[PDB]
Design a binder for this molecule. Structure first.
Ligand SMILES: *Cc1c(COP(=O)(O)O)cnc(C)c1O
Ligand SMILES: *Cc1c(COP(=O)(O)O)cnc(C)c1O
Lengths: 294, 281
């Protein structure tokens, strides 16, 4: 039997037991939590490191550098352990300690920056380090190796678990590799599939995703892939997520109970509606932050 | 169409790539963290409840009881919502908000409100035979399959003890010898999910005929190994699971060309705030 890395992907697709409207419009869950490192990110991290062991770029024994909100942090830490890389991650210091700790536990080098510096500052600091000789920068935000994972794996999966049937795909936007990569695959399907994407409102802190300031716009984005972009409230992200285990037994991050929000908006909108919503990790690395009770 | 229930079970079997004796043996771990609740107790929980319908005893609206505080509280709670059951759970110590998230409730002289007939039918995981049934029905066939029937030693960290019993249950009926070893703390070792009764037990579901040896693990080796599984193998798990692989390693050490499999009951994510993934010496 099988290797941890071949335990990444082929994730379950589960329809909403009870929640939301019912007007013929069905909603199915992409369960990325199940990934060995517990998030959607593992697909991209694998892709990224093995695609670049392939173009001869990186090689075991090497140090790798990434700036993270955590998940990709925890992701590349894992795979590295599996293949004998050393990792440093760059993260801001307002993210949770469960995020801190899982990255450390996998034996990666963790560097925290100010929250006032936040994600864009950790990117800036990432670039410098590498261009000073402190390691190789894989750059999930501009690496087309990240959306390739979804476009290769995620996308073809969603289609065959809905057969040839999905009408909508709702995705929470961070890196944007998921939406973009899943969008590539679907464009080619000789039927129409509407890819919807979600961003925090004005002042809406939700971990996993961002509306990226202008000069930090992910190179991998591609507006022609994204039909609509929806705006998601931080409280309606925590409200639906909590609604989701209580009412569905699906135990998820806020990013996920958010994407179900939009997904429900779509269904609540379109009847006849097969709407696959991305759930990114689980509820556990959010537990100690008071979001799931206190 | 699929559901969470069918996402319970058929977990990944994972071979150690660089920890163990270099003498012939192959240690393979069974990734029970994968369960939709992220622990082994999803299998029993669903069974326990599901089989309490094959024999009609509970209604999707019925009040279920169990005084647990951890993973069982999580899976049980987990499955009730799946099926529309009203679960109520009781107490640990004096940390685990992962229960009420699933919609549960806060709270004899074992120790350890109120009682069965009082308010709802308690599940009695420590006696309920549908505990090892799960392993007998699933966790046994799976490992048997995945290993090409090549498994020589089963290893398990022992709480409600159902896991080893059922898998031994299934194991015994196979046409080859399959030794079965349960893991227990040394009596002052504090390891979550496994305790050294009698502290007056054995659990009801236990079967000395089904075990083949019992090694004692200290707290220091469990925490240490779980430490090593993370950095050295990319395996991030809780402290009993750390104990499992250390037991498998002593077995492997004794039994050269062996094929050993140990259950990883859960991923280490609920453990991080304990700080148990900081090293010590
Ligand atoms: C990064 C991340 C996302 C975003 O997916 P991207 O492909 O980066 O757009 C969503 N949720 C979580 C928890 C994430 O970590
Ligand atoms: C369930 C559990 C055990 C024990 O397994 P049992 O089948 O109950 O003997 C050990 N450790 C942890 C973390 C568990 O959850």
């Amino acid at each position: 039997m099988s290797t941890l890395e071949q335990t990444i992907g082929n994730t379950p697709l589960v329809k909403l037991q009870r929640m939301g409207p019912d007007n013929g419009s069905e909603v199915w869950l992409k369960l990325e939590g199940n990934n060995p490192a517990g998030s959607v990110k593992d697909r991209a991290a694998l892709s990224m490191i093995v695609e670049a062991e392939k173009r001869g770029r990186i090689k075991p024994g090497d140090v790798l550098i990434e700036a993270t909100s955590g998940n990709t942090g925890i992701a590349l830490a894992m795979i590295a352990a599996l293949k004998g890389y050393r990792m440093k991650l760059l993260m801001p210091d307002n993210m949770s300690q469960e995020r801190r700790a899982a990255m450390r536990a996998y034996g990666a080098e963790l560097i925290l920056v100010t929250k006032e510096q936040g994600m864009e500052g950790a990117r800036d600091l990432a670039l410098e380090m590498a261009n000073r000789g402190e390691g190789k920068l894989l750059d999930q935000f501009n690496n087309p190796d990240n959306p390739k994972a979804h476009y290769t794996t995620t996308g073809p999966e969603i289609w065959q678990q809905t057969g040839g049937r999905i009408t909508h795909f709702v995705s929470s936007m961070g890196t944007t590799g998921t939406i973009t990569g899943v969008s590539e695959f679907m464009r080619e399907q000789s039927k129409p599939v509407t890819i919807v994407g979600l961003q925090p409102e004005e002042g809406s802190s939700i971990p996993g995703i961002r509306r990226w300031p202008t000069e930090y716009l992910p190179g991998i984005f591609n507006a022609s892939l994204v039909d609509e972009v929806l705006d998601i409230h931080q409280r309606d992200a925590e409200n639906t997520m909590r609604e989701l285990a209580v009412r569905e037994g699906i135990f998820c991050g806020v990013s996920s109970g958010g994407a179900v929000a939009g997904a429900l908006r779509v269904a609540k909108a379109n009847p006849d509606a097969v709407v696959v919503a991305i759930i990114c990790d689980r509820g556990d690395r959010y537990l100690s932050t008071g979001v799931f009770g206190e």
